[PDB]
Amino acid sequence: HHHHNRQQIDALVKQMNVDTAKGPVDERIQQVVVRLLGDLFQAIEDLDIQPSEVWKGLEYLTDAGQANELGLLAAGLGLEHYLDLRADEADAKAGITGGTPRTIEGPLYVAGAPESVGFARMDDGSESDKVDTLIIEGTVTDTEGNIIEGAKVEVWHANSLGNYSFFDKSQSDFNLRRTILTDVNGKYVALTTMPVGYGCPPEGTTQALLNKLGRHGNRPSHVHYFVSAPGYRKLTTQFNIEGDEYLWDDFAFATRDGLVATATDVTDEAEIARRELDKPFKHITFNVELVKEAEAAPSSEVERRRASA
Template sequence: MTHQEIDQLVKSWIVDSATRPANPRVQQIVLRLTSDLCKAIEDLDIQPNEFWKGLEYFSAAGAANELGLLAPGLGLERFLDIRADEADAKAGLEGGTPRTIEGPLYVAGAPVSQGFARLDDGTESDQAEVLFMQGTVYGDDGKAIPGAQVEVWHANLLGNYSHFDQTQSPFNLRRTIIADEQGRYQFRTIMPKGYGCPPDGTTQKLLDLLGRHGQRPAHIHFFISAAGYRKLTTQINIDGDEYLWDDFAFASREGLVPPLVRVEDPAAIAAKDLQKPFATIEFDFHLNAETAAAPATEVERTRATA
């Protein structure tokens, strides 16, 4: 069949057969996706066995709750960010901290701290390197934003996230920090490790067939928000990681790899009430003012809650 014939056929299924009021947007999207899929079946000569194996794959991925992992692994979540960047540029927004993907592992309701928080529960202190991260949240006018909200979360030394990993304490390595009067935030935590897709999971199964690894560099996730400003979803990568620029989720971006400084000075160590060297990262966030000229940055999606 020609593409035009396919378009006409699918329209007869999706649109012309409707006998009750339809949601126009849903109808538009389903019509397009179904037409494109039928064209792919025709163009690639996809056989019934292949089609049904594909459906079985998506059923298994959904049952394993891995569709949120598959989306970044195929670049779809990065593509949404590319489109958002283009919309910002069209609206004249510039100078903000680069956005990057949220991923599937945020949990709402993390404990709130003022100005400073310790993220880790201490269970990995003997094996971990202590990390301090601090900075200021600025608006696009260059002024600090007092009371800005900094939500932060990251993986433990095994590359696992609390809540999804039941061996960790609730909200381990997760906090919400309210910036102080100078817009400053700071937290103490452990140096995170990168992680990989579950080796026997559905995402890694597809990546294997595509000849790709499923590894992420060590990173720290953030939501940054303040009244009157566009919410920022981003993450910083830990400099020097093996997968720094080879992230299976395509989330690594220039401007999100801050310098990592390791401190060995005894006086500085004592000032932090530590008995061993530590690492520190200084990183400022820059928010753009809210505007109706660009799409909203608050994404409605189902997220975990503790």
């Protein structure tokens, strides 16, 4: 089945994509195209991939882009997690230690959420008779415990059905999405509802491929974070909730030590009144430690096309 060797493949890729160039070329794009196309041709030779199989692959990728699921596919195949493994190794090689650990952004961030200082209520109350109330609170500090005032804490999470606003058009714009600036004591408080885990769209392209791989498409319950402050490295992270069936079996491999929180139960009448609530609730503490920016530090910001509203 080997019709071309790697020398012959490299020569053909060069003839088609490099020899044909006239004038200014983007050298990085040229480098990446030449590498990936040569690698594709070699895998076609090694696995004897048939034309019908190549076309099915391209039709799948077309359908995935049309469904806006390529970000989801990157999470599910573990490419998104792999980028984090690389970033962690680059930071170790720089001697960066400390800081709350990073994990994946996922494909569902939306820019433009309501901003407030110290406190936000994240939900619109439309599920109040069908989901538990959750209070999240924490302090943002540097690596020696000094508070950081005015840190931007951005949080987003799913509703009682595992659905996110903006993507789920039945929810109000920005439901369960807020930006909270830490107060004079480095504190943020979010009044919200308990998120549930969820799967991929069952009839979508990501689940179709996972099915062929014998894999589920479920994530455990979590709340996403971006945390940033002047003079500090931006953080992309989450917390997970102890007790979830999928805690250590996330189809996107995002759970890590340091990021699992326990939801405590508050049933005490006095404490409930003090919080201005009328029913028992769940409470999570999630403190965040930020690493100070250094001249030597690799960038911790990621340019990525994100929804906005």
